[PDB]
Design a protein around this ligand. Sequence first.
Ligand SMILES: [Mg+2]
Ligand SMILES: [Mg+2]
Length: 415
Amino acid sequence: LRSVFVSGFPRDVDSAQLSEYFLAFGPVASVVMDKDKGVFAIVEMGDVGAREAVLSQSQHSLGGHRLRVRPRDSHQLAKALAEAADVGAQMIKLVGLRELSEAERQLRSLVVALMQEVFTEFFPGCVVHPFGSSINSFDVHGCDLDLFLDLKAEGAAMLELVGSILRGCVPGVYRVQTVPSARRPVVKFAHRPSGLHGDVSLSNRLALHNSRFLSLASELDGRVRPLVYTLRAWAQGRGLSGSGPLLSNYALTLLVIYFLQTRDPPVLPTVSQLTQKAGEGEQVEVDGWDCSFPRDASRLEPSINVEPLSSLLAQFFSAVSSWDLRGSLLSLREGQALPVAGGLPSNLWEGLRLGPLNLQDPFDLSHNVAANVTSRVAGRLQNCCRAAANYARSLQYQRRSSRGRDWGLLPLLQP
Ligand SMILES: [Mg+2]
Ligand SMILES: [Mg+2]
């Protein structure tokens, strides 16, 4: 597909002139005007890279006329987002569509209850804590159900025992696979009646609190869920968020939250500030790290930041693209970037893994959630952010479309 659809050039303009214009971007193979009609025309470039170079620039003009050059479940999403009022309404609608329905959530709680009632007989006093995607209120349709069982060879034996229990005892669950061989040992399971799948971890415990923190963030400000959902969909769109060297959903969420912490008025407070507001009985530590923070966001002061969702999204793209990733450790606790060269963040907090992208976990401070991210992924993240930022400054992002044209979020959510 080296050919591009080009329309909008003035009446009585030569195809040789279009050829001459597109000649700047590279070799032009052919230019064919619409024969019986007029208006648009098709331009085939010599190189596919030249075609990508033409599509790369959103600003085209000839003879004083601006040119439109375009290459030439999900459909429900696009249609619904096209029906919205503006960018903000689009983001909120995206949240409403992707988020779990109440039936799904209560179904999840029911399944958790089943698992608990089965496990309690084998391990008296054991507690099954749902964590991650389900309880952090960033949940999406068909997301994993991750359970933590609260009670390295003995760990493997115990893991196999849990696998056996899931296999032969609790009714309805199939696809049981024990995985001791991973950084965090886990037992994969699938419950058939509820149509759910997930992982059971022996000790993930710290992560549980992380989830809670995330939830609190969503309760602290109303823009958090739209921003995080939208940026999740976007990162998954550009191939940024993911499994391998790609960013994890948790790391991305942490990045968005950090961005919200770094705004001129803060949208979210720093984790340290939350720890200060914890209070008696809410004090909790895990592996030496302080995990404490308020139960409800009601007794916490609101955000004086008046920035709308659109401006916050554009500011996210711009700021993330503008940051220095390799030389900075992004801190959620202090809500700011701590310089790597000088300040030696690796001295205190021993075991901290630095690199292309450094993002510090709000509780365990020796943990870089972005440590897995390679140079290519980081650079491509900043590049995509620069792109999206330049797009957010256009009229296509800011305003709606009269009929049928993709506007606002829709170009950002496409592959
Ligand atoms: Mg019973
Ligand atoms: Mg999973």
